[PDB]
Amino acid sequence: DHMQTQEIISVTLQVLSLLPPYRQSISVLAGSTVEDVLKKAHELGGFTYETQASLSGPYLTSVMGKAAGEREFWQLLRDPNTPLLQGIADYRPKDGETIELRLVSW
Numbered sequence: 001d002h003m004q005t006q007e008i009i010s011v012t013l014q015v016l017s018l019l020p021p022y023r024q025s026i027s028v029l030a031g032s033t034v035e036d037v038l039k040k041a042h043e044l045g046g047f048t049y050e051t052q053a054s055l056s057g058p059y060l061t062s063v064m065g066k067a068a069g070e071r072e073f074w075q076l077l078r079d080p081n082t083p084l085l086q087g088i089a090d091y092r093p094k095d096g097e098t099i100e101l102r103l104v105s106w
């Protein structure tokens with residue numbers, strides 16, 4: 001007989017490395033991971049991605065039908081131009097953040 005409460009936050013998910021680009025505000029509970037944001041964007045319709053289960057956890061391999069090729073990867077960043085220091089299953093965005101998926105070659 002007591003109330004609990006959680007914070008709903010909004011994370012902007014953006015992909016500028018594709019034609020057409022993707023940019024959508026995604027609502028999730030605070031504590032959701034980037035992977036949960038991608039799952040919600042896919043549920044909403046209009047976002048697709050793939051992952052593979054590496055020995056380090058979920059590794060993002062494809063975004064909106066573009067799989068990273070040889071010596072390419074999908075880099076995770078927050079605005080402004082700040083690479084994330086954790087992967088999709090561990091980074092927990094904050095309200096108002098913009099998460100960018102960027103195709104990068106090394």
Ligand code: CNC
Nearest residue numbers: 054055056057058059060073074075076083084085086087
């Ligand atoms: C080189 C490297 C490294 N990476 Co990268 C970096 N920078 N990485 C990369 C590259 C690998 C290219 C290749 N060689 O094929 C690159 C450059 C592709 C990369 C990718 C990423 N990396 C990333 C991160 C954060 C990390 N990476 C390390 C694992 C991190 C390593 C830091 C370290 N010294 O441990 C690292 C420096 C080298 C590991 C290695 O050479 N041996 C690993 C190998 C011997 O064993 P393994 O288990 O088979 O390794 C594979 C996986 O680790 C995978 N991998 C690499 N990074 C990640 C990150 C995640 C989350 C996962 C699930 C797998 C990987 O690639 C390895 C080769 O196949 C990391 C521990 C370095 C760090 N101190 O932050 C860190 C993981 C932190 C965590 N979650 O615990 C990115 C999330 C960065 C970003 N903001 O985009 C990104 C993954 C996003 C995605 N698409 O899912």
